[PDB]
mmCIF file of C-alpha atoms (C1' of nucleotides) and ligand atoms in Angstrom:
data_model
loop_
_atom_site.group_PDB
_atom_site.id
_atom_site.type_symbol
_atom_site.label_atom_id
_atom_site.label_comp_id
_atom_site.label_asym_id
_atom_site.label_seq_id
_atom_site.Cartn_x
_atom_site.Cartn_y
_atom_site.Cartn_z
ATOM 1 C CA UNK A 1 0.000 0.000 0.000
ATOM 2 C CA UNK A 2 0.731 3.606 -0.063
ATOM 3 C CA UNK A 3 2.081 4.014 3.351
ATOM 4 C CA UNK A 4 4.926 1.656 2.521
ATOM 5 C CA UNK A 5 8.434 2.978 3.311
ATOM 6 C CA UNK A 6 11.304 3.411 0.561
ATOM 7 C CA UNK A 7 13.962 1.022 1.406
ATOM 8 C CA UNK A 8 10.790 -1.621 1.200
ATOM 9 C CA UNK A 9 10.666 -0.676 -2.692
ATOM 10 C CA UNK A 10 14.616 -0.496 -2.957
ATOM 11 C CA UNK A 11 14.991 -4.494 -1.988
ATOM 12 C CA UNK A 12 11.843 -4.623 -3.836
ATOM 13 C CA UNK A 13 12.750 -3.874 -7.268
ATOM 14 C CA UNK A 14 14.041 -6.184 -10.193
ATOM 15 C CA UNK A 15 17.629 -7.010 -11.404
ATOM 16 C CA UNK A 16 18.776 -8.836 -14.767
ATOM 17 C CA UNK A 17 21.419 -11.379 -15.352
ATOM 18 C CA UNK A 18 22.932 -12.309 -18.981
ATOM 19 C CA UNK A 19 25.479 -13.355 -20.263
ATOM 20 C CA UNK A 20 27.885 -10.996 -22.767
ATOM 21 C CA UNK A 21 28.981 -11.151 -26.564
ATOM 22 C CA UNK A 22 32.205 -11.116 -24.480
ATOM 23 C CA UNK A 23 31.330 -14.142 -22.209
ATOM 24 C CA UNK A 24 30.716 -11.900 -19.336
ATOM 25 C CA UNK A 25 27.734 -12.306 -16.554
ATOM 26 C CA UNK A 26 26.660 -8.898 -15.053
ATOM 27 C CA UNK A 27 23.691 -7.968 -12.896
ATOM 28 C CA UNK A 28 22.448 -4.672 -14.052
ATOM 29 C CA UNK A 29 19.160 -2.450 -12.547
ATOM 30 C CA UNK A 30 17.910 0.754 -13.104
ATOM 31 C CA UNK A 31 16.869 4.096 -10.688
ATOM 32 C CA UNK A 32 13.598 4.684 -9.513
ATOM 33 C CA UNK A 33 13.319 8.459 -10.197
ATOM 34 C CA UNK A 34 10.277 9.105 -7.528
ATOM 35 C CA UNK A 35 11.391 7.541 -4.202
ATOM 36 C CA UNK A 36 10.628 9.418 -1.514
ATOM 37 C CA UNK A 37 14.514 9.742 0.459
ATOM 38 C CA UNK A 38 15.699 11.645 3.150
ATOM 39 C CA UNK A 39 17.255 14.272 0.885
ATOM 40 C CA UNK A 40 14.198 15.037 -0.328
ATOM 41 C CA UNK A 41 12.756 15.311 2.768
ATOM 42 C CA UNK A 42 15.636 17.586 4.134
ATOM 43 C CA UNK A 43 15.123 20.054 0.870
ATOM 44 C CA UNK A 44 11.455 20.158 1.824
ATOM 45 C CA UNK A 45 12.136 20.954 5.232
ATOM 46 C CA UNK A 46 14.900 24.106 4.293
ATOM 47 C CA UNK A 47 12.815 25.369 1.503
ATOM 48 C CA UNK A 48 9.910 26.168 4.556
ATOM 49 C CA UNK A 49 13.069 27.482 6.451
ATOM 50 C "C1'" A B 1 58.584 72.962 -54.870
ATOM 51 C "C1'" A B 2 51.836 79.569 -55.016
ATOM 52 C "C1'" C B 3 56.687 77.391 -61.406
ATOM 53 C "C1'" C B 4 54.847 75.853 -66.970
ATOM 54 C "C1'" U B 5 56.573 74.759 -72.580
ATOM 55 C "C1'" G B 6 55.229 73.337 -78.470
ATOM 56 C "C1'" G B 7 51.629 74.763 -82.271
ATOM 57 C "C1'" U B 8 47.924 80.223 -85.442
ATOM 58 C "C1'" U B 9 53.080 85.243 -88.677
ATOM 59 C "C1'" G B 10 57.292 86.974 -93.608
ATOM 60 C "C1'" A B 11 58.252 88.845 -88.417
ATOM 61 C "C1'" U B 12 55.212 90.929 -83.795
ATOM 62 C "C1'" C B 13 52.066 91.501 -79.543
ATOM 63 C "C1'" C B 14 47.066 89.157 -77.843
ATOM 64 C "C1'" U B 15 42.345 85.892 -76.425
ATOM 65 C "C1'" G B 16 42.225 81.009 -76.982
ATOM 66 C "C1'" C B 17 42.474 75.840 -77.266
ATOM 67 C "C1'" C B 18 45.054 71.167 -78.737
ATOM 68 C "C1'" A B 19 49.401 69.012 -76.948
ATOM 69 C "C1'" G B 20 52.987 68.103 -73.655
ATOM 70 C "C1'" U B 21 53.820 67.850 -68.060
ATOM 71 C "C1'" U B 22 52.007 65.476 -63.096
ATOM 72 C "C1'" A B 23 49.310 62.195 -59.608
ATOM 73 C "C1'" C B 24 46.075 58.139 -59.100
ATOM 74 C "C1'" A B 25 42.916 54.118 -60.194
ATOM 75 C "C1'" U B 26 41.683 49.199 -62.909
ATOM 76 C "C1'" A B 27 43.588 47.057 -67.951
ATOM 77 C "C1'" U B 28 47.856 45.418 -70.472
ATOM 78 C "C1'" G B 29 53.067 44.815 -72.942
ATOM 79 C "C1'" C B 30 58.161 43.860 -72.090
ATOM 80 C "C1'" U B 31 61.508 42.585 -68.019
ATOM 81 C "C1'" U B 32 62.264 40.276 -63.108
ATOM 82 C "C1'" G B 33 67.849 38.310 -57.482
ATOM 83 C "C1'" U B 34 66.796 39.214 -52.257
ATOM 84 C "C1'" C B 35 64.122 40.260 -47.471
ATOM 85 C "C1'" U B 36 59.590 42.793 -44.868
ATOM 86 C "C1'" U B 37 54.130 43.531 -45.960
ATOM 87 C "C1'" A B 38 49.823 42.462 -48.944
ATOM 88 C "C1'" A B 39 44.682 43.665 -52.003
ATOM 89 C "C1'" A B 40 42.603 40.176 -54.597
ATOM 90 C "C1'" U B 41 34.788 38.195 -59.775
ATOM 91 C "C1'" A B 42 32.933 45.073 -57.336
ATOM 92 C "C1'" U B 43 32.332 46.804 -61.903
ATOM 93 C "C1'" U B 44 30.034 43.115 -67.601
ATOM 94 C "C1'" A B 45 25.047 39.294 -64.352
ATOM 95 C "C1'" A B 46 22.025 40.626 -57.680
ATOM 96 C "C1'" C B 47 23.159 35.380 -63.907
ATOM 97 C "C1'" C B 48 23.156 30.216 -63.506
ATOM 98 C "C1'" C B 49 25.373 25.862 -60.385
ATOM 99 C "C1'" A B 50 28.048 19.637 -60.065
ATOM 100 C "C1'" U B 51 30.983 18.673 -55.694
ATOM 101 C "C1'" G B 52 33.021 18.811 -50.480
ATOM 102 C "C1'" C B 53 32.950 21.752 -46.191
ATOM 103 C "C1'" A B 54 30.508 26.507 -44.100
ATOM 104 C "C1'" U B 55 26.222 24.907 -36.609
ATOM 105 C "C1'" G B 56 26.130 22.584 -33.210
ATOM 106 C "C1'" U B 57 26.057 21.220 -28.210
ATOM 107 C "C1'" G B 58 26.263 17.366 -21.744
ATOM 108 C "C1'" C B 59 28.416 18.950 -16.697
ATOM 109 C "C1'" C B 60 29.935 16.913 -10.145
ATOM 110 C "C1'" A B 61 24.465 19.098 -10.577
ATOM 111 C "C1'" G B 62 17.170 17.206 -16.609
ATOM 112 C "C1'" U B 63 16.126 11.366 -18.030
ATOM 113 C "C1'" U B 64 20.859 5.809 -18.804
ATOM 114 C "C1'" C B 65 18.035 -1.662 -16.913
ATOM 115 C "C1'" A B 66 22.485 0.449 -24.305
ATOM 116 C "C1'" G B 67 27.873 -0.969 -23.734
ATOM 117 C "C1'" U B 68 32.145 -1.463 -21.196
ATOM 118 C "C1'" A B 69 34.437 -2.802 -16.371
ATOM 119 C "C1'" U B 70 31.821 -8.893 -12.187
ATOM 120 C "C1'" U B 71 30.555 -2.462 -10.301
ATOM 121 C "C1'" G B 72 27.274 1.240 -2.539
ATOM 122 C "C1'" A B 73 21.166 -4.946 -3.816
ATOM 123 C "C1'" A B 74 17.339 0.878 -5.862
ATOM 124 C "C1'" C B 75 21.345 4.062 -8.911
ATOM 125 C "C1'" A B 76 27.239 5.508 -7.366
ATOM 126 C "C1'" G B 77 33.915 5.494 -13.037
ATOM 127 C "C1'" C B 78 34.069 6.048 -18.191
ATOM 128 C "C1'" G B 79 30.257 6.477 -21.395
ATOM 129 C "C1'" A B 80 26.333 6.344 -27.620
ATOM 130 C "C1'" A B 81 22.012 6.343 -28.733
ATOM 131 C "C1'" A B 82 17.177 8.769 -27.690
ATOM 132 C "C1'" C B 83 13.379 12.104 -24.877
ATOM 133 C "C1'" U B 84 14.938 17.003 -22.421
HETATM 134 MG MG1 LIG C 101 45.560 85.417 -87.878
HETATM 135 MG MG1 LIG C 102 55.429 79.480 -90.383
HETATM 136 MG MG1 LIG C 103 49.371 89.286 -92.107
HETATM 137 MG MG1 LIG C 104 45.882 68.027 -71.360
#
RNA sequence: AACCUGGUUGAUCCUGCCAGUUACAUAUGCUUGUCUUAAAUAUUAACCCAUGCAUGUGCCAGUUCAGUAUUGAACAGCGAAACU
């Protein structure tokens, strides 16, 4: 639900495994552009100030 | 260098012009060893056009699940595309 806190959605995201051209195996993932962190709660806060 | 000289007569003195004389612009002919400097399709068509180039751009600080590198388990180096 809504009320559920960031680092639940952090550990709840996806990842992807494959395997290179070059014979490699990475584990890539992507940002999530709209969690709610501390940062932007401190900006929030000194804007007000 | 605030200069002028030849030509109208058989001689002469005049107006007066043609001519010479001078500078400077493009043209052009002939001739060219250095160094410094340098204009350059404007005039005749603001006429026509092959071809190549003449305008692009990213950070620490708008979006990277491209790719690299086995890299803070959300994402942290470099770093194209593409939306901005
Ligand atoms: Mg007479
Ligand atoms: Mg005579
Ligand atoms: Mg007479
Ligand atoms: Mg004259």
């Amino acid at each position: 639900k809504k009320e559920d806190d960031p680092i639940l959605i952090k550990k709840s995201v996806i990842r992807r495994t494959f395997k290179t051209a070059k014979g490699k195996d990475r584990t890539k993932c992507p940002k999530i552009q709209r969690l709610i962190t501390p940062e932007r709660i401190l900006r929030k806060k000194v804007y007000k100030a």
